[PDB]
Amino acid sequence: MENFQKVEKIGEGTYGVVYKARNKLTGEVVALKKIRTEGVPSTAIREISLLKELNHPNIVKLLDVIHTENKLYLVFEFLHQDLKKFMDASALTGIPLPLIKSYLFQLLQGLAFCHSHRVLHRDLKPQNLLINTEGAIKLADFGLARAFGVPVRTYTHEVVTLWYRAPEILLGCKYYSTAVDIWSLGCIFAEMVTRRALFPGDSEIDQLFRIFRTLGTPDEVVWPGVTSMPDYKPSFPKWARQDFSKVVPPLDEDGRSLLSQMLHYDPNKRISAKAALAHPFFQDVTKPVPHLRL
Numbered sequence: 001m002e003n004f005q006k007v008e009k010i011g012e013g014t015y016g017v018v019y020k021a022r023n024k025l026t027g028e029v030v031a032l033k034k035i036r037t038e039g040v041p042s043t044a045i046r047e048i049s050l051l052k053e054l055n056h057p058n059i060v061k062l063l064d065v066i067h068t069e070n071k072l073y074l075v076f077e078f079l080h081q082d083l084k085k086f087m088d089a090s091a092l093t094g095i096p097l098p099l100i101k102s103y104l105f106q107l108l109q110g111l112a113f114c115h116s117h118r119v120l121h122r123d124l125k126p127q128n129l130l131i132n133t134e135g136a137i138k139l140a141d142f143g144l145a146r147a148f149g150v151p152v153r154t155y156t157h158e159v160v161t162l163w164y165r166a167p168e169i170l171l172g173c174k175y176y177s178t179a180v181d182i183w184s185l186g187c188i189f190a191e192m193v194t195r196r197a198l199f200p201g202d203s204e205i206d207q208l209f210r211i212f213r214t215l216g217t218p219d220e221v222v223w224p225g226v227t228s229m230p231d232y233k234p235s236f237p238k239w240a241r242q243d244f245s246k247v248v249p250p251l252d253e254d255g256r257s258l259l260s261q262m263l264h265y266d267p268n269k270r271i272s273a274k275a276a277l278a279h280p281f282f283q284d285v286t287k288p289v290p291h292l293r294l
């Protein structure tokens with residue numbers, strides 16, 4: 001793997017570290033994800049390789065999937081900045097609402113695309129959302145959990161982010177649906193608006209309880225079957241739902257209603273990416289140019 005010259009390390013994902021690198025021969029700049037290790041599931045590299053066919057303006061292009069030295073390398077087109085960095089950079093002033101709306105709209109288009117192709121992300125977070133100078137935003141690292149699975153931590157002892165995990169995952173559901181990505185996106189949307197994580201849990205139970213304290217402890221009324229979920233305990237405290245206008249001020253009612261639909265407890269009631277795109281919140285969507293400091 002010396003076809004490059006690891007320009008630099010740029011991040012650490014749940015499935016592995018990401019590097020910025022230039023191809024010695026072609027001179028192209030790409031992002032290299034190294035996936036943690038002496039076997040690798042059979043259908044894994046096959047399933048991941050299929051992702052190379054995925055082409056959508058809001059999905060980071062997967063250029064190559066190489067298996068060498070028992071290691072797995074994903075070569076991605078390189079985008080210049082991740083949403084986490086941009087959010088931190090915009091923490092004093094905040095991301096303008098029209099830009100937030102644009103990003104949410106584009107992200108939903110990208111999810112609508114993947115979900116229609118039966119591809120789920122399962123680990124969406126600000127770190128794997130990439131932006132460019134032209135106002136586009138793209139999702140990176142889809143279908144990795146389906147091909148592999150959520151490990152103990154990361155390739156090299158890291159603190160996995162739980163803040164964007166859907167409640168059905170926290171409750172131990174064996175089968176998840178595309179609804180998990182809508183939940184994560186809802187959490188990201190809220191964070192872009194308030195400039196603070198919606199549910200910053202430090203543990204799985206703290207994550208779950210933070211959700212409960214805000215949205216109310218779920219019951220059979222709002223979520224049929226929740227009390228029979230694997231990790232559900234009748235001992236969970238019963239918090240009453242908080243007034244929603246407290247959740248994402250000062251987002252307007254259209255944004256709040258859309259967000260509430262993205263955060264429904266029942267995966268079956270949670271809005272789909274396709275239905276969300278038709279929400280009145282996007283009636284006036286535009287495509288602003290962000291102020292990016294590279």
Ligand SMILES: COc1ccc(O)c(-c2nc(N)nc(N)n2)c1
Pocket residue numbers: 010011018031033060076077078079080081082127128130140141
């Ligand atoms: C699949 O993961 C990817 C794919 C393509 C990418 O450009 C990135 C990325 N890019 C930047 N600039 N920063 C950071 N932190 N990451 C990450």
